[PDB]
Design a protein around this ligand. Sequence first.
Ligand SMILES: *[C@@H]1O[C@H](CO)[C@@H](O[C@@H]2O[C@H](CO)[C@@H](O[C@@H]3O[C@H](CO)[C@@H](O)[C@H](O)[C@@H]3O)[C@H](O)[C@H]2NC(C)=O)[C@H](O)[C@H]1NC(C)=O
Ligand SMILES: *[C@@H]1O[C@H](CO)[C@@H](O[C@@H]2O[C@H](CO)[C@@H](O[C@H]3O[C@H](CO)[C@@H](O)[C@H](O)[C@@H]3O)[C@H](O)[C@H]2NC(C)=O)[C@H](O)[C@H]1NC(C)=O
Ligand SMILES: CC(C)Nc1cc(=O)n(-c2ccccc2)nc1-c1nc[nH]n1
Ligand SMILES: CC(C)Nc1cc(=O)n(-c2ccccc2)nc1-c1nc[nH]n1
Ligand SMILES: *[C@@H]1O[C@H](CO)[C@@H](O)[C@H](O)[C@H]1NC(C)=O
Ligand SMILES: *[C@@H]1O[C@H](CO)[C@@H](O)[C@H](O)[C@H]1NC(C)=O
Ligand SMILES: *[C@@H]1O[C@H](CO)[C@@H](O)[C@H](O)[C@H]1NC(C)=O
Ligand SMILES: *[C@@H]1O[C@H](CO)[C@@H](O)[C@H](O)[C@H]1NC(C)=O
Ligand SMILES: *[C@@H]1O[C@H](CO)[C@@H](O)[C@H](O)[C@H]1NC(C)=O
Ligand SMILES: *[C@H]1O[C@H](CO)[C@@H](O)[C@H](O)[C@H]1NC(C)=O
Ligand SMILES: OC[C@H]1O[C@H](O)[C@@H](O)[C@@H](O)[C@@H]1O
Ligand SMILES: [Ca+2]
Ligand SMILES: [Ca+2]
Ligand SMILES: [Ca+2]
Ligand SMILES: [Ca+2]
Ligand SMILES: [Cu+2]
Ligand SMILES: [Cu+2]
Lengths: 709, 706
Amino acid sequence: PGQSQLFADLSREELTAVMRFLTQRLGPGLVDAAQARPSDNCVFSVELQLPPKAAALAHLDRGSPPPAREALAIVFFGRQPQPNVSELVVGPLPHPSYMRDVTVERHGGPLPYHRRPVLFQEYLDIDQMIFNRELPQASGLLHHCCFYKHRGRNLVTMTTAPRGLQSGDRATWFGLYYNISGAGFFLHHVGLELLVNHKALDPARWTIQKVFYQGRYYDSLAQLEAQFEAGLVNVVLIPDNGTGGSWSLKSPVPPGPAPPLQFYPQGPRFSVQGSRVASSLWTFSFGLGAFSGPRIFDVRFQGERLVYEISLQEALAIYGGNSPAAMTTRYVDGGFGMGKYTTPLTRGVDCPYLATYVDWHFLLESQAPKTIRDAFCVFEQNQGLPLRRHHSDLYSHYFGGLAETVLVVRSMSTLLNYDYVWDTVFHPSGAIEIRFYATGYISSAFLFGATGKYGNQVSEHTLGTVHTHSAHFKVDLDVAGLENWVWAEDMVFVPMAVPWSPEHQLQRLQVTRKLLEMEEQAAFLVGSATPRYLYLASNHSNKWGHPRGYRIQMLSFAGEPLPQNSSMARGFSWERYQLAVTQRKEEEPSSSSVFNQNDPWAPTVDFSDFINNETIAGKDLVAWVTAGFLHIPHAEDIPNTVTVGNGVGFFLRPYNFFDEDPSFYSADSIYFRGDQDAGACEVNPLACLPQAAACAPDLPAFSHGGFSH
Amino acid sequence: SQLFADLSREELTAVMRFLTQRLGPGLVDAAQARPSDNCVFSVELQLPPKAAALAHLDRGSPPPAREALAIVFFGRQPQPNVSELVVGPLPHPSYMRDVTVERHGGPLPYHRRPVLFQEYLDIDQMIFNRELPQASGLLHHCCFYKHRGRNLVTMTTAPRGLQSGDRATWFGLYYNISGAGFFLHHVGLELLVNHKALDPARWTIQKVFYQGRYYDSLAQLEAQFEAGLVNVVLIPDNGTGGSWSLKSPVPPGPAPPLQFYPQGPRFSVQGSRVASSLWTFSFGLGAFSGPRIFDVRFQGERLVYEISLQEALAIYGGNSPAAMTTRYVDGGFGMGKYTTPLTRGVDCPYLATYVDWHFLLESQAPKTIRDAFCVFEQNQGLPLRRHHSDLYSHYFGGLAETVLVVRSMSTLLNYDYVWDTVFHPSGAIEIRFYATGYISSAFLFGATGKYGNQVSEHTLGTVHTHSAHFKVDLDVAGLENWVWAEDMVFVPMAVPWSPEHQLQRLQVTRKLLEMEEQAAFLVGSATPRYLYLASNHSNKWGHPRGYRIQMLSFAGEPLPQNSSMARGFSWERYQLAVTQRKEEEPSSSSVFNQNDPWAPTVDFSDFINNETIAGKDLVAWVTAGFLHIPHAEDIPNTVTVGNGVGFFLRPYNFFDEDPSFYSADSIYFRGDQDAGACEVNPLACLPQAAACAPDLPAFSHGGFSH
Ligand SMILES: *[C@@H]1O[C@H](CO)[C@@H](O[C@@H]2O[C@H](CO)[C@@H](O[C@@H]3O[C@H](CO)[C@@H](O)[C@H](O)[C@@H]3O)[C@H](O)[C@H]2NC(C)=O)[C@H](O)[C@H]1NC(C)=O
Ligand SMILES: *[C@@H]1O[C@H](CO)[C@@H](O[C@@H]2O[C@H](CO)[C@@H](O[C@H]3O[C@H](CO)[C@@H](O)[C@H](O)[C@@H]3O)[C@H](O)[C@H]2NC(C)=O)[C@H](O)[C@H]1NC(C)=O
Ligand SMILES: CC(C)Nc1cc(=O)n(-c2ccccc2)nc1-c1nc[nH]n1
Ligand SMILES: CC(C)Nc1cc(=O)n(-c2ccccc2)nc1-c1nc[nH]n1
Ligand SMILES: *[C@@H]1O[C@H](CO)[C@@H](O)[C@H](O)[C@H]1NC(C)=O
Ligand SMILES: *[C@@H]1O[C@H](CO)[C@@H](O)[C@H](O)[C@H]1NC(C)=O
Ligand SMILES: *[C@@H]1O[C@H](CO)[C@@H](O)[C@H](O)[C@H]1NC(C)=O
Ligand SMILES: *[C@@H]1O[C@H](CO)[C@@H](O)[C@H](O)[C@H]1NC(C)=O
Ligand SMILES: *[C@@H]1O[C@H](CO)[C@@H](O)[C@H](O)[C@H]1NC(C)=O
Ligand SMILES: *[C@H]1O[C@H](CO)[C@@H](O)[C@H](O)[C@H]1NC(C)=O
Ligand SMILES: OC[C@H]1O[C@H](O)[C@@H](O)[C@@H](O)[C@@H]1O
Ligand SMILES: [Ca+2]
Ligand SMILES: [Ca+2]
Ligand SMILES: [Ca+2]
Ligand SMILES: [Ca+2]
Ligand SMILES: [Cu+2]
Ligand SMILES: [Cu+2]
């Protein structure tokens, strides 16, 4: 009816077109982001502006004309007497002709300039101040401890956390580490940690305001030499070569027989075309925000839409430690960007070999579109489980089952050391499983002092620092329509007398159903009682009279939220909740904000604002889910944290939404009575895989979508 | 060794030969037996003692004697009992040996014995030939009564009465639906049969239930119907749509994704031993307790002596007596006994290895359940691990998780339970169970909605909980283990370099749990985030070699303690508990608890009794479950999705570095290489494609119980 693809990310043309539009009317002194100074004017990002929902649905459902495709741009305006970041909407694509400043509309005033993310340039300007005007003042020490030459670069920095202690601060603790080659630098901290202040717009004005060496705090790298020279510093010598997991990543073992391989014996059974995937049961668009990360829209099971949007909103990591970097590190990874940092998927490792892979395009900190090759994979997996089965020996004498095969969509953000895997998986039953693994390397500190309270030793000199991971997701169900209710069902035992034997007691198992009517009644804090059955449902009912529902079951071992006493906790208020449900809104598009990380004491978005007692009885509702877990690192996280058991997320499960299990109708289901031949091709499809069905494809030659330079 | 191998058909035969000659006449085949008879109910492996078995495995000592355990029904005598008799040694038994009093302290009350097949047979005779006809009038207008009730069928329930000693079972009535689930077609009528007498001929019917009303006999019921005081509605006895069928109407399409092993299978199976590059173990089936694995070693080093299923438990709500008073303890029937063939391609991957299983239960000859186990290797389409670096140095390394898997399925009335043990190459072990098959339904007579959902025409989907119990005999770096609990906390502190500013200081929190009840964790109370069994042997970085338990469970609130029945499955009240392993505490429950949980033959909470768990041979007990409120999507079956429950056993400083780092299947390259070159990267190589195909074996099926 409405056949447009209005959820798709911008093409290169589209991106270019918007850049050209902007170039022209920003004007006096627009610099390329990739070399911008603080005092420059800069285009930080250009990406899709999502359509408003009312119009989108009108188009898709009621055949109306589609809304204007627009793009949003972030502009650092540094070349003024009162710098600002600005958000600018630009359309209508593909040939734009207007531009609108929506900053004060969305934020209520101008964006203070320090909120802006640190630029690639800014990182380089810092690393010069470090390696040219600072480390030099301590070649004595460094020649001694850390194999340092002239200046040379054998070391390497890495950033942290918020940057400072107050709204307004821009001061980052940087750890120093050996530039290892072909493997992870994060394990090889050298015990040096500089607190670089960089608020000023003139990099010359940038001071170092504290030093930390191997357990001790000094006021500068001068003092540090003074003492080292004065023999007054006991210095630990940390190697820069080694062998095994803390050094390498290459398995020293030769390839053995081949892992199992999965193929689609007579062609695939889904198809991807643009941002749009379609299979016999399922239909959806998939995307990728620069900063939010992955998203799917307009999901439909057999024609019927369940969810308008499911989308990553934020990712969080909270550290402890001995040493000022980690003890103060609260990463709000959106402020770097889960899209911006998405990475190629290595065919046969990150997804099955025959997955279909799909490029992503972007214009970030640049002036022309680039592309991450193979950023998404989509594939149909045979789970090795049945979805359902029943064997009957009792009375008759039949078998009926179906092997679960499933449809997956994956992307991976790789930020610093972390490799986040994001999955969404679509089940034949009509259920949707969201999963989030964390792999890759481990951020580490130099092992020194009271360890046990702050992690485990994992390699020599190497503390695996304790941290919590948490992720937030937006789940905008539209259960059989916009207007939804949320219900809480649970159990209870009521002690009673056996009706037919009143001497005796029995414990009466009962169901309990309560209707949650206000936003607060459906806001569940971490470590609180949570209804065993929580679902959103329609006013409409199914064929047996029960409300049509989708149940949210969580899979989270959430750590313990940063205490609310912390003046920075407003910057990730969503961590306090397991689950919340809120009235959907155009002014509440996101949980978080790329600007939250560099000023969480004065948040651009405070998710707790969304919970503001309003009815959730029969409105357009959106459910916000938090998933996460505490990580105390240990030896088996070397070289990499492994995915097994680190999976975390939620199901969306149909609860009296249908009138019966859709999989009853699967083409793949199997059935035979005891009185039949089950090794008969006409009774049973599986009887005729061997002769003569399907002959295993020739494989694409391997290839890889490479690295950023 | 073939030390934990269930009994061969030849061995099983030879014990029955012995028991036969040595119990003399009369002694009847249990498939014939009446209560007053003598009877071999079951003959299965007696698992050896740990000490003597480790002796033989770790120190070339000779093997502990191989013994059977026969359960015998001694009805032909003034004082009737059940006896547990050990017989041995195998393969040619010379001795036999009553151990009943040794284990239990008395004899076994005969009313604890499982209902035989004959018993059920007889109970049906009585109902169908001498009871239902008294209401043939009502049953004609209710539900198509005929000849003589060939259109109807019964199903047992839970414990069988209201106190110790009773043997009175509520049975529902259902249409004998052809080639699909009767469980969805409760005809509205429930009978409380009393079958305690040793004379089947003395069997009363204590009570009757119809449409929300209880009578004292079928005759009193048919009376009130004839008197027009009972509104009957005619219940349809056929239909369409998987209320009535399992066969799909939609014809089969292009095939789903097939896995294969390009250069052959990478594991082997000899007898009951599975061997692979990384994992080596033995597997089997307890007739009552079900699936189990032993002597699990990772790269030669033992992690677990034994992991096994102890019990399975379903507890109901309801409008009707049969449901509202139903707590099954499915071990009472037997997960091993009721294990079913695995349908190749559906229950496991087409190219799994499927193993037969032998048993001698309620008969005098051994028989086989074909394709009862499947073992296979499975590509997860997930990386075990991976890092792609664009920062400072350009490389990629990672590895796709393939996983090794053992499975059997128990089918108990309406349920199909799936028992999965999955072996990861991180060195982790994952235990999973899945509830599928049919639900049980009650006939729907309004005032429901505290007890379930209408789920079909005339059917109530009855609320219940599921639970299962696992014994986990971790020998972390030898027998002597301790248990640690670690977790997290936030501590307000001034910021060193800026004391005016505060800061929430995140810290780990560790604690040794010396005494059994420090490590007993009840449902509803909170659990430490990290919890593992340690050796005192430390790893290279100076940390106690550990194996963490991590639980995946949504457990439903357990039957309250106040219930006189509860001691029959006291494990339900715990998520986790750790205990001194003891030869006199082999099992968490017993086959005899079902039929008398008020006088429980084994009560689990006895095992927790203020001993020390600092430095002894520990065994961990894990309870996993969920609340199940049925709904339409459970028609025809309940699906697996989201219903997995179990636990992970995870290395925690057990090794010095992740073992996967030595993987034969690992992939690595730097950007300065040609990732498409076969010898930079084994993925850029082509093994035998097309050319042509995986070669697939001819399909076949185990069959049915005949
Ligand atoms: C954040 O920074 C931007 C850019 O500096 C501010 O927007 C700019 O505002 C000036 C007037 O304040 C606009 O001037 C307009 O066009 C010409 C100059 O080109 C001028 O002579 C006219 O009087 C007219 O006002 C300028 O075009 C505009 N630039 C953009 C790109 O929108 C903005 O006001 C700052 N944000 C806040 C909240 O203060
Ligand atoms: C449960 O019932 C068991 C079988 O009825 C019973 O085992 C049998 O015990 C009797 C004596 O209690 C033994 O009979 C023996 O009696 C004469 C004495 O005049 C002996 O010289 C002979 O050895 C003769 O066989 C049976 O041998 C014995 N049978 C077996 C298979 O053990 C148990 O004792 C009863 N258990 C309890 C706890 O009461
Ligand atoms: C090539 C140059 C601009 N270096 C960097 C690139 C870069 O993407 N990051 C970065 C910053 C935050 C998260 C992930 C990566 N940091 C750095 C960085 N970090 C410390 N110094 N430089
Ligand atoms: C043909 C005869 C042997 N019938 C039965 C066999 C049987 O295995 N069961 C059974 C009882 C409980 C759990 C699983 C199966 N029940 C019955 C049974 N249940 C009610 N009537 N008969
Ligand atoms: C670190 O080493 C890599 C290759 O191993 C080299 O190409 C790169 O330029 C080095 N980077 C530094 C020292 O920042
Ligand atoms: C139910 O239907 C089957 C179909 O053959 C029949 O053989 C079986 O005996 C019937 N069961 C009963 C209890 O009548
Ligand atoms: C660990 O403690 C046990 C218990 O007595 C002892 O036998 C063993 O040798 C110990 N080993 C070490 C290294 O402490
Ligand atoms: C459980 O325990 C008490 C014991 O007094 C019993 O009377 C009742 O059924 C229950 N009540 C409470 C409050 O625990
Ligand atoms: C049980 O607890 C008591 C404390 O009264 C303690 O003294 C004793 O050692 C424990 N006894 C057992 C059963 O080991
Ligand atoms: C229930 O709610 C609204 C009014 O509050 C109504 O418009 C809607 O159509 C209703 N659905 C029903 C009665 O099924
Ligand atoms: O079967 C029982 C039988 O064997 C026993 O060993 C003997 O003691 C006999 O007295 C007896 O008749
Ligand atoms: Ca709100
Ligand atoms: Ca909604
Ligand atoms: Ca043990
Ligand atoms: Ca004990
Ligand atoms: Cu982590
Ligand atoms: Cu269930």
